[PDB]
Amino acid sequence: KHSSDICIVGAGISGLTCASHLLDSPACRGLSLRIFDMQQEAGGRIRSKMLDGKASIELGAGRYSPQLHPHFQSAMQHYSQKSEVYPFTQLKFKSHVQQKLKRAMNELSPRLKEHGKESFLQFVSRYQGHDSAVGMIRSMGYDALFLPDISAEMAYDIVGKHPEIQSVTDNDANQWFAAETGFAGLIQGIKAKVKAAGARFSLGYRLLSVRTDGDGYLLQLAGDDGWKLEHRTRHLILAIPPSAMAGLNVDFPEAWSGARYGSLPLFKGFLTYGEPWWLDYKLDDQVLIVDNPLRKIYFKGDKYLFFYTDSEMANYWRGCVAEGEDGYLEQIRTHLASALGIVRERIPQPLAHVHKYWAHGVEFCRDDHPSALSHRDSGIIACSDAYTEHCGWMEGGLLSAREASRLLLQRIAA
Amino acid sequence: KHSSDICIVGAGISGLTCASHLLDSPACRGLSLRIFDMQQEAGGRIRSKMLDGKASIELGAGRYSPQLHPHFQSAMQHYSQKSEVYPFTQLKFKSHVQQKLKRAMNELSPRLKEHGKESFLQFVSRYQGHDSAVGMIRSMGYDALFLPDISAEMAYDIVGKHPEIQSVTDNDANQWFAAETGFAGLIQGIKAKVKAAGARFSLGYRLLSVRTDGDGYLLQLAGDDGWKLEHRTRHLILAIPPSAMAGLNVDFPEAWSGARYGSLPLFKGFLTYGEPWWLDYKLDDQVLIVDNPLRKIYFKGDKYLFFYTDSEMANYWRGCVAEGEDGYLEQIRTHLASALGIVRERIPQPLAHVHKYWAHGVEFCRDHPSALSHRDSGIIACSDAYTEHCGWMEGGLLSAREASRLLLQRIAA
Numbered sequence: 001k002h003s004s005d006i007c008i009v010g011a012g013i014s015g016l017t018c019a020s021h022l023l024d025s026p027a028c029r030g031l032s033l034r035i036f037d038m039q040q041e042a043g044g045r046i047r048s049k050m051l052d053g054k055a056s057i058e059l060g061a062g063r064y065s066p067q068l069h070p071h072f073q074s075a076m077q078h079y080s081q082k083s084e085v086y087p088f089t090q091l092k093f094k095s096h097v098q099q100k101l102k103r104a105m106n107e108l109s110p111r112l113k114e115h116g117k118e119s120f121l122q123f124v125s126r127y128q129g130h131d132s133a134v135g136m137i138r139s140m141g142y143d144a145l146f147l148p149d150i151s152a153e154m155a156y157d158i159v160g161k162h163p164e165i166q167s168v169t170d171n172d173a174n175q176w177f178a179a180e181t182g183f184a185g186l187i188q189g190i191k192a193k194v195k196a197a198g199a200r201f202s203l204g205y206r207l208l209s210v211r212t213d214g215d216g217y218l219l220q221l222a223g224d225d226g227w228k229l230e231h232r233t234r235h236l237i238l239a240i241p242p243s244a245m246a247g248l249n250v251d252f253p254e255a256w257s258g259a260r261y262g263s264l265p266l267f268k269g270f271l272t273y274g275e276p277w278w279l280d281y282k283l284d285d286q287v288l289i290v291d292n293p294l295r296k297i298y299f300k301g302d303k304y305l306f307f308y309t310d311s312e313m314a315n316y317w318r319g320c321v322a323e324g325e326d327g328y329l330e331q332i333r334t335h336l337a338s339a340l341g342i343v344r345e346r347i348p349q350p351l352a353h354v355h356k357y358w359a360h361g362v363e364f365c366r367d368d369h370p371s372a373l374s375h376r377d378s379g380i381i382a383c384s385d386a387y388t389e390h391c392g393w394m395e396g397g398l399l400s401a402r403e404a405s406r407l408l409l410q411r412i413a414a
Numbered sequence: 415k416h417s418s419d420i421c422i423v424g425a426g427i428s429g430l431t432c433a434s435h436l437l438d439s440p441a442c443r444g445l446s447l448r449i450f451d452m453q454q455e456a457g458g459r460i461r462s463k464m465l466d467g468k469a470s471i472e473l474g475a476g477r478y479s480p481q482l483h484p485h486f487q488s489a490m491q492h493y494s495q496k497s498e499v500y501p502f503t504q505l506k507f508k509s510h511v512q513q514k515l516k517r518a519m520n521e522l523s524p525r526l527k528e529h530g531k532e533s534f535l536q537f538v539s540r541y542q543g544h545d546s547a548v549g550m551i552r553s554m555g556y557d558a559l560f561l562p563d564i565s566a567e568m569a570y571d572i573v574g575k576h577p578e579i580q581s582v583t584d585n586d587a588n589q590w591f592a593a594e595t596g597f598a599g600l601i602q603g604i605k606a607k608v609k610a611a612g613a614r615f616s617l618g619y620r621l622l623s624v625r626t627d628g629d630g631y632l633l634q635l636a637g638d639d640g641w642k643l644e645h646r647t648r649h650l651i652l653a654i655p656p657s658a659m660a661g662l663n664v665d666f667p668e669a670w671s672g673a674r675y676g677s678l679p680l681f682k683g684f685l686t687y688g689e690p691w692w693l694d695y696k697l698d699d700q701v702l703i704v705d706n707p708l709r710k711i712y713f714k715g716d717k718y719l720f721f722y723t724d725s726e727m728a729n730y731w732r733g734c735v736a737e738g739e740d741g742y743l744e745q746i747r748t749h750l751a752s753a754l755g756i757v758r759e760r761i762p763q764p765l766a767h768v769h770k771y772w773a774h775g776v777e778f779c780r781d782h783p784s785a786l787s788h789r790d791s792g793i794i795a796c797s798d799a800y801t802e803h804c805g806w807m808e809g810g811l812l813s814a815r816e817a818s819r820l821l822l823q824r825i826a827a
């Protein structure tokens with residue numbers, strides 16, 4: 001009828017990888033696989049574009065570290081995707097305050113296990129001043145570091161494992177790379193392997209409902225053009241983020257794990273120009289962290305620039321775009337001049353610009369934790385980056401995927 | 415403030431026409447006007463794509479008649495759009511039954527006085543057999559004509575308004591045109607002109623609910639990337655179809671009119687080929703109406719063919735499309751073969767192909783004005799469906815004009 005042996009929902013690097021680690025196994029010879037995804041394209045939070053012709057840009061994930069993420073490096077080589085050196089690993093145009101970061105936080109780790117699980121702003125604020133702790137943090141660029149849920153021990157892990165301000169640790173042993181053609185090439189590689197082993201894709205359809213009926217599961221999905229449809233599958237993987245799980249009839253997260261989950265929004269805007277004006281300032285392949293609302297400002301070669309914000313600042317910029325595209329472009333050039341110490345009529349307007357916003361850009365856990373969850377009752381398997389040590393990286397996907405593969409192949413064998 | 419004087423929800427031809435009329439009035443000189451649409455692109459049911467390399471295909475509204483659509487033709491001329499002749503006005507292959515039916519149709523006409531609001535199916539069941547009735551009613555290629563909510567009165571009118579079957583009625587004199595750069599070319603022209611007047615477009619935002627708060631209104635929209643959004647406006651038109659209206663919190667249909675509304679699904683599939691393999695059979699600019707699922711097969715010059723289906727037979731193809739692309743492409747050359755009376759293998763595989771399904775492609779009119787008003791809250795609604803041209807984009811064009819004027823009623827009140 002309209003059915004399958006195994007069903008994976010979600011075609012991010014997680015669910016896509018789940019499928020490969022399953023077709024790989026003979027325990028699955030003959031069994032049919034069907035994969036759904038809301039988007040019409042595969043890759044989830046991995047989306048790569050070509051910016052009005054020209055070159056390839058990265059609206060989602062953009063870099064990896066062979067040191068931090070060893071499995072992602074093997075998936076790159078496995079599907080033979082060329083990497084390139086990621087340029088934005090430290091700071092030339094350091095202001096006054098982003099020179100004291102290293103001397104401070106190196107000697108600002110006496111109470112890492114003496115104060116403890118305190119929120120991270122009220123930790124750094126108990127030894128330097130507050131009107132001087134809001135200055136040291138805001139000069140690191142990530143506004144994730146001002147929040148109640150994230151803690152002081154959670155917040156130093158974010159400093160050391162992000163390329164632009166890891167030099168504020170013993171963490172320059174980390175090299176950083178980006179995909180030469182975009183991570184889209186990795187996703188297309190996996191997608192090809194899985195179609196070839198005979199899985200069947202159904203992109204465009206979004207899952208709304210699951211009932212258990214007997215041996216398997218009955219899913220209610222809504223294509224993106226109104227068409228509803230149902231799928232019965234005997235085994236079911238829900239490789240989607242934890243914000244996605246709440247949307248469903250599946251007791252999330254009580255039935256899966258005694259944990260709570262959070263999320264932060266992210267925003268990126270890209271700008272290309274007729275003449276590549278920013279070279280007169282020796283700003284090739286470099287990055288400026290600023291107090292103004294742009295926050296992080298990146299200059300890729302002589303081809304485009306872009307900026308990257310989070311939390312409240314992400315929600316700041318989704319606000320300007322709502323009131324009007326021109327108001328948006330006029331405000332970032334105001335802030336661009338502010339940042340270069342120049343007048344706003346020295347800053348050209350762009351030809352082409354694009355921009356994406358992620359309502360749940362990064363999903364994480366509070367506070368142990370297995371790499372994949374299961375329903376205590378119905379044995380649905382849930383796979384996501386958020387359930388792993390590396391909540392928030394592609395490595396989290398690859399780990400949760402290898403896991404959920406074996407949890408499901410168990411549910412099959414014997 | 416995310417505030418505005420006037421706010422049009424919907425950027426189909428209706429909504430963009432309300433915008434055009436208001437911005438041409440001085441009772442709106444220096445009044446703010448924002449237009450929302452959940453889509454990422456204006457047009458609504460008018461969507462034009464380039465298929466393959468140099469084929470302009472019309473996935474939504476396709477053709478118009480200077481006889482039945484004078485306001486559309488004016489609009490196309492007003493905006494320097496050029497339109498070509500629509501070739502699909504004759505059946506070169508009238509079948510036994512679809513030869514014996516111009517005559518069969520004429521005779522029953524005065525039995526529309528006798529009993530005229532029956533099923534069009536029930537209606538023909540009387541003159542001929544229920545069996546002889548169905549083969550006649552099916553040879554016209556619009557399965558909507560089997561639904562019971564379609565009276566024998568409007569049946570005769572739907573037949574007469576369509577270019578492939580109008581010879582069966584005494585509308586055989588109507589001419590037909592299609593835009594050549596695609597009807598999007600018109601939509602773009604209005605968009606561009608309503609921009610230059612200073613309206614402001616927030617596209618990719620979807621109205622979820624609306625609350626009255628005294629003077630004006632408070633709209634809660636959700637961006638397509640998840641961003642929630644509140645917007646405050648003084649005057650509100652909802653240039654959205656009925657089915658869209660049922661979705662929102664505003665009481666509809668009851669706070670608005672007596673009538674209830676219905677809709678049909680529509681399907682359209684297109685295929686281009688390596689060489690134009692239908693020219694040997696003399697089929698360019700022909701249209702065959704068959705009794706198999708394809709239903710209406712069109713052959714456009716030497717550029718592509720397509721088919722066009724509705725009601726039950728639309729859901730049949732949205733179904734076979736979901737059960738994998740592979741057999742869809744294969745049921746089609748199967749059925750292309752029967753229609754031609756050739757063996758399956760003389761029909762080549764296609765290189766490109768695109769298809770579209772509209773869940774509510776036609777919305778209709780089942781004692782009725784051009785543009786609705788809320789009894790209590792007095793917000794304005796306008797769509798093709800509130801008109802004598804339900805299902806036609808002339809219905810949009812004039813519902814919009816009544817609606818626009820119905821609002822400036824509110825500007826001096």
Ligand SMILES: Cc1cc2nc3c(=O)[nH]c(=O)nc-3n(C[C@H](O)[C@H](O)[C@H](O)COP(=O)(O)OP(=O)(O)OC[C@H]3O[C@@H](n4cnc5c(N)ncnc54)[C@H](O)[C@@H]3O)c2cc1C
Nearest residue numbers: 010012013014038044045060061062063206207385393394
């Ligand atoms: C701006 C940004 C930058 C990033 N930079 C980096 C980086 O440099 N390095 C790094 O390692 N990681 C980075 N990441 C994170 C990385 O992209 C993610 O961790 C990873 O892609 C998540 O993969 P996933 O397979 O768990 O699911 P996702 O990639 O989140 O995809 C989930 C899929 O499930 C689908 N889905 C959801 N819900 C439903 C439903 N009800 N029915 C059907 N389908 C559904 C979604 O469409 C999606 O396709 C970044 C993320 C963002 C937003």
Ligand SMILES: Cc1cc2nc3c(=O)[nH]c(=O)nc-3n(C[C@H](O)[C@H](O)[C@H](O)COP(=O)(O)OP(=O)(O)OC[C@H]3O[C@@H](n4cnc5c(N)ncnc54)[C@H](O)[C@@H]3O)c2cc1C
Nearest residue numbers: 424426427428452458459474475476477621775798806807
């Ligand atoms: C396959 C097909 C063929 C057709 N052929 C013809 C033809 O040959 N001749 C002819 O005259 N007509 C034809 N039509 C119909 C014609 O397109 C419509 O009658 C006309 O476009 C009506 O458009 P509209 O302005 O009423 O709004 P629509 O085009 O119906 O759409 C209005 C807009 O409002 C948006 N919208 C809706 N709801 C909400 C919400 N809750 N929040 C925000 N935004 C929203 C919609 O997304 C849409 O963009 C055809 C239609 C179809 C489907």
Ligand SMILES: N[C@@H](Cc1c[nH]c2cccc(F)c12)C(=O)O
Nearest residue numbers: 142144158162310362391392393
């Ligand atoms: N996309 C980021 C990862 C990131 C950005 N902000 C936060 C906050 C908390 C945890 C995180 F993993 C992140 C990057 O790849 O640079």
Ligand SMILES: N[C@@H](Cc1c[nH]c2cccc(F)c12)C(=O)O
Nearest residue numbers: 556558572678724776804805806
């Ligand atoms: N504009 C459509 C009309 C259409 C097609 N099927 C039906 C059924 C009922 C009413 C209708 F107005 C229609 C067209 O020309 O295709």
Ligand SMILES: [Mg+2]
Nearest residue numbers: 010012014015
């Ligand atoms: Mg995934």
Ligand SMILES: [Mg+2]
Nearest residue numbers: 426428429653
């Ligand atoms: Mg409209």
